[PDB]
Design a binder for this molecule. Structure first.
Ligand code: NI
Ligand code: NI
Ligand code: NI
Ligand code: NI
Lengths: 299, 299, 299, 299
């Protein structure tokens, strides 16, 4: 059954069992849901109410523009013509950009700086706990993620409607995350997040004040396939969550990722610079003919 | 209570009462819901299933493009990033364009030609019934709508998600329709359509296999304010309709609209060409300075 | 012949003749070209080189994105597929926004603050010179433009290619400017700006280090038709200017514009709040039915 | 010096020398310019005048929309705000779509059907001439391009302004064409097309009534590197061409491309299905993690 982990229990006598759940989650699920994670409910509830406030502003503004755009063509804009989807990204590390993102309150910007510093601390704690389970030095993964300027840490803030009906959302393509460790905060209890475990869809159980954690492709490389990045997809439920803060703690652009030499005995995962993996992901690496001829010879 | 009108009863002994409901609806509601309207359930159910099929194709295509667009920026497209709103228009009269609209099946195009001819016949029947209640010649409104080339008749086909939550949709601007007579076919029974009667929102009652009819600004002019066009808005409900075919039967561009001289005794509504009203609606009429100076002198 | 005015000559013995040219320009041309205007060539040449630098960055960035967008569809982006047009606005008064506009250098932002303060001083000087020619109190127009928070002052920065060929640009719609006083700085000497004087197109003569000034609709109201806002259009020449900084000094949103009572003897121009004129200009004023019925009755 | 080839001379006594020029062009230039190519000047001049007519319609329409869009925001659209770039594609083989492309005259559609049939005949002639020079069977390349349904043949029609200045266009990325054989028809004599021969830019010489031909990546594979696809880019000149019809004759999606076994003695170019090469080109092939791990191991 799905790993739900009370993170505070790692401080007390039930540490061995809690670290075991994390080990089990990392090896067999690629995902776990955290509660009692050292981020107050007051802080999370602030983030929710404020983000929903910003969203409400954007939709009232968007409708005024739609009515004007549509009226230009001699057509009445209905409320049913609304694009309810809104998403924007907030970079934190190595260079923050919360001061430069358009159309935010100063008190909103300040709470997201507070939210980001809290999350990188949680992210870095979890990586240390992983380091311990793997039998590795403290801060090995933080070190490996660093590169020169430091690790890439940012947050995708999204607000969205429910899906019109399930059968449309069926047959949609899933993915594994290319990054390092990914921390999802949502409103409600129902995430609408599904894992593809043994050919079948398992829903992430609903939990209030939770943070859902999962491991990306980079940690699979570093652990030499031991902690695998798992196939998944998020879908908006009819009476579930309609707000998602997805914070990605990835390696820095120039960080050289490779399997930790300790975790290699008797195939071997590759060595590469993180930006090149992301450049492959975005289709930039085969923009000339000679590379394409290499690739077609390999196949 | 809201006028629900069985149109077949106009053929039988209960005609007087049915015409009375239409008169009451036209004068005090500006809206009525038709059942038994001479369009088979089989024909409507075909239109629904086929349109939803086309919509499903567009969303699977749209997601493939989104995943590719987002991957270009080194970002994973989630299903929650989907724009579920899709809308396109089908002109019928005076010049049909169902053959030229991109990405439709031939069997779909053919059903919409069949659907359009059925609706203009219903539209023109209703106008005659209105002519009778007003004490006017048969086909007076059809005549008045004609102009030179004939009346404008088309259909807005829309598919959309539910609204994330009510409080966002609250405070949204309502309208009266600028056109002639407007016929709304929907799936489900719940329209999500609201009238603004005496300062308060009244929902259009849910009815299966119904066509909701309402009168636009042009009929108010022609009736000299007797049949007023009513304030309204449509909002997508959480478990209501998610498909809307809104067919507008408006006057032709060059049609001269004015109050029928019979309906004038002891202020008088204006005379104008329909295209000029629509050019005013779209803000094209005050594109030069001299017109603006006229308007500011009037205020 | 077109009014070219050396502004420094207003300090010396040739003031009467220079003020006469301004009077003539304001009454019979609606336009004049300033030289020796109290903005150093060094300051203007800085603005040019820096803005062209920012533009070059945007086009290299835009092409990288186009190549990626087009490659997504299995198509090679040619250089001939480039959208060379780029335009952005910089608000100065009442609230500056040069700090918040994306993708600018700090040294660029700082020069535009310096450029803006210089131009509002020039703008306000010219309005005083107009006040003198009209026989009005010093700062009357600045006062009238103020409202509550102060006048609207901003700058449209544009970079663009030449027009493919003249015959495409022929038959294009001209305008008068809705605002107050409009100050155009360009690179090159050839503006590509044309006036519509007595039914015929007159080119603004080419002059290096010039600022082209023209009067908008608001000054025509305030002068009771004496200083008329003139029809014009700007067109990119094959070997002329390819950069335009158009700074608009308009009245504040809440400023009540009306003909100065001194300038009224034996029709009278209207009184209105500036925002309402701009709301009429944008087609927002006839978004409901009752207003439209007023307008159609007037016609 | 650049290969300019009179194609009619292949019928007469000067055939050996003309075929030698084609061999030289194919081996050392990857490009040649055809004259007297069996497409009348009357037919080409029709294509030019008609396409420019369609373009003029689109720009007058685009400006009307821009003026309305910009006026919505309380801003005057200048002619200098125009996006002059317009481009659309016309599929011919295996399935024509000239009947379905929006906003074309019937007489325009018909001329493009006539133009397409002429070009595929020219394309297939040239491939036979190449087959002869390579020492291959007649129609070997046409056969190899076929797959199941037949070869992909279409035409990119583009209209565009000149580049604002050269130094912006400098440092822009060049390419080789991924397709088969590519035939460029232009107005004017100046193409603005440049080859990257021995590290340096060579302009394609200006010639009236010419068709510029070049070889893509697929022909390099089939010839086992003998006929190489050459680096190039097209740039709009200040007083050169402003219209480009680029017709691509590529292999069919399912066509298996590989080096002709005759042309292999003592590295070997790869075998692949054409769609997979184009799927690699568009970045779709590394959308999952396992493929990316293969690619990073190879590097
Ligand atoms: Ni994910
Ligand atoms: Ni409506
Ligand atoms: Ni202007
Ligand atoms: Ni090319």
């Amino acid at each position: 059954n799905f790993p739900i982990i009370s993170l505070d229990k790692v401080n007390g006598v039930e540490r061995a069992a809690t670290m075991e759940m994390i080990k089990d989650a990392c090896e067999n699920w690629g995902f776990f849901e955290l509660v009692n994670h050292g981020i107050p409910r007051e802080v999370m509830d602030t983030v929710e109410k404020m983000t929903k406030g910003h969203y409400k502003k954007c939709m009232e503004q968007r409708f005024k523009e739609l009515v004007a755009s549509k009226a230009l063509e001699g057509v009445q804009a209905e409320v049913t013509d609304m694009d309810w989807e809104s998403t924007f990204f907030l970079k934190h590390l190595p260079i923050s950009n919360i001061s430069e993102v358009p159309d935010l309150d100063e008190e909103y910007r300040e709470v997201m700086r507070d939210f980001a510093k809290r999350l990188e601390k949680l992210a870095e704690e979890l990586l240390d706990l992983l380091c311990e389970n793997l039998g590795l030095e403290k801060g090995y993964l933080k070190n490996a993620f660093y590169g020169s300027k430091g690790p890439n840490f940012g947050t995708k803030v999204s607000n969205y409607p429910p899906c019109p009906k399930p059968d449309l959302i069926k047959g949609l393509r899933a993915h594994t995350d290319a990054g390092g460790i990914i921390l999802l905060f949502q409103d409600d209890k129902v995430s609408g997040l599904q894992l593809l475990k043994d050919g079948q869809w398992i829903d992430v159980p609903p939990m209030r004040h939770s943070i859902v954690v999962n491991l990306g492709d980079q940690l699979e490389v570093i652990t030499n396939g031991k902690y695998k990045s798992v196939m998944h997809r998020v879908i908006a439920q009819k009476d579930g969550a309609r707000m998602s803060l997805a914070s990605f703690y990835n390696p820095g652009s120039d960080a050289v990722i490779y399997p930790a030499p300790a975790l290699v005995e008797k195939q071997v995962y590759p060595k590469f610079v993180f930006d090149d993996y992301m450049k492959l992901y975005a289709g930039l690496k085969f923009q000339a003919k000679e590379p394409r001829f290499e690739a077609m010879k390999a196949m």
